[PDB]
């Protein structure tokens, strides 16, 4: 018959923790997906040049890493700290 006074810790903390859990885990998942994109991006780049010696005409494309490099750094950074007390 008397909840919210100390309830605003369990319904808060455990929720904010369960919610911080996803963010920190999820962020980790993204990291790998990015490392997959780089390789993927690159590998395509190779598979296309290699095609210049087989097909009639080849796709003249580059592959800027700057973009990947960027996020590579941001996310790596964003992995600081979240909740503790």
């Amino acid at each position: 018959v008397s909840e919210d006074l100390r309830s605003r810790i369990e319904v808060l903390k455990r929720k904010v923790i369960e919610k911080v859990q996803h963010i920190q885990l999820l962020q980790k998942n993204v990291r790998a997906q990015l490392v997959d994109m780089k390789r993927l991006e690159v590998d395509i780049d190779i598979k296309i040049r290699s095609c210049r010696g087989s097909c009639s005409r080849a796709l003249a494309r580059e592959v800027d890493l700057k973009d990947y490099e960027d996020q590579q750094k941001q996310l790596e950074q964003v992995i600081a700290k979240d909740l503790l007390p």
């Binding site: 808060l12 919610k19 010696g53 087989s54």
Partner: protein, 309 residues
């Protein structure tokens, strides 16, 4: 803000839980397009695995000479490997075949300039130039080869000589009993007698009017082949180094096809700082200052065509 700022926190984590859930919804849908993209590429990589198509092909029909091949059942002019009876290893030649059964084994052709004919002894001995299957490439098959074919199993050979001006008119000039000798003999040319050729017989020599000994001094029969680095002509020094080629010289010539390709066909003494009959000439047909547009020396076993068609 006791529970005024607090009732909102317990309300925003939902707004967040929504964003969280949504992002997972994309991260997954991304791994999708990825796993697919990956197979799409394999699909691709499998396509790019075969090298450029090389339009030039060789027919595996092999013989002692183009005739022995056309005889063997051949049916098309192109590149073919052959190996003479006395040969220790075959070699590529271009054969010209007609709808009659002729194995015209070719040994020299000119038509654009592409190949500079001023080559050394060895280059004439081994052969130079390229062989398009269609024959739109200049080349000297090479004396050693020419000889080897011409002296195999006491087989009787002839030599058709196709020439062409720059106004589309052509003329043949055949030499029955064609035979080319050993390097030992400086590949010396030798044919018994002239035959059906309206181009004339420059091989019997020509009285250019410059002097009355010209005819016996420009004739080519039984003459030894000579380059700039190997003189065996019947002239003080070498006509080759002068004209700029390799040929059977004898106090020079009355008809030599390895002459410097003169575009247009017409030339003078103003050409070279000295001037010569160094152009592709066949006087018996046209002036020493006229250079043929095309030129082809081909042999065929004499046993074949007697006059034409």
């Amino acid at each position: 803000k006791m529970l005024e700022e607090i009732m909102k926190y317990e309300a925003s984590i939902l707004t967040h839980d929504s964003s969280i859930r949504y992002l997972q919804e994309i991260y997954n849908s991304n791994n999708q397009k990825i796993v697919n993209l990956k197979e799409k590429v394999a699909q691709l990589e499998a396509q790019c695995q075969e090298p450029c198509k090389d339009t030039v092909q060789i027919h595996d029909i092999t013989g002692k000479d183009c005739q022995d091949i056309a005889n063997k059942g051949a049916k098309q002019s192109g590149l073919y490997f052959i190996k003479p009876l006395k040969a220790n290893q075959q070699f590529l030649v271009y054969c010209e075949i007609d709808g009659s059964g002729n194995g015209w084994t070719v040994f020299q052709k000119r038509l654009d300039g592409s190949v500079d004919f001023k080559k050394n002894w060895i280059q004439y001995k081994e052969g130079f130039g390229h062989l398009s299957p269609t024959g739109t490439t200049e080349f000297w098959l090479g004396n050693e080869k020419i000889h080897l074919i011409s002296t195999q199993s006491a087989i009787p050979y002839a030599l058709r000589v196709e020439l062409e001006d720059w106004n589309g008119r052509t003329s043949t000039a055949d030499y029955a009993m064609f035979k080319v000798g050993p390097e030992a003999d400086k590949y010396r040319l030798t044919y018994a007698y002239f035959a059906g050729g309206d181009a004339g017989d420059a091989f019997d020599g020509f009285d250019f009017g410059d002097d009355p000994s010209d005819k016996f001094f420009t004739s080519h029969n039984g003459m030894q082949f000579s380059t700039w680095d190997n003189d065996n002509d019947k002239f003080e020094g070498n006509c080759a180094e002068q004209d700029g080629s390799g040929w059977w010289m004898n106090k020079c010539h009355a008809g030599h096809l390895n002459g410097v390709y003169y575009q247009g066909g017409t030339y003078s003494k103003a050409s070279t700082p000295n001037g010569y009959d160094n152009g592709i000439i066949w006087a018996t047909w046209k002036t020493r200052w006229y250079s043929m547009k095309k030129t082809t020396m081909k042999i065929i076993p004499f046993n074949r065509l007697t006059i034409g068609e």
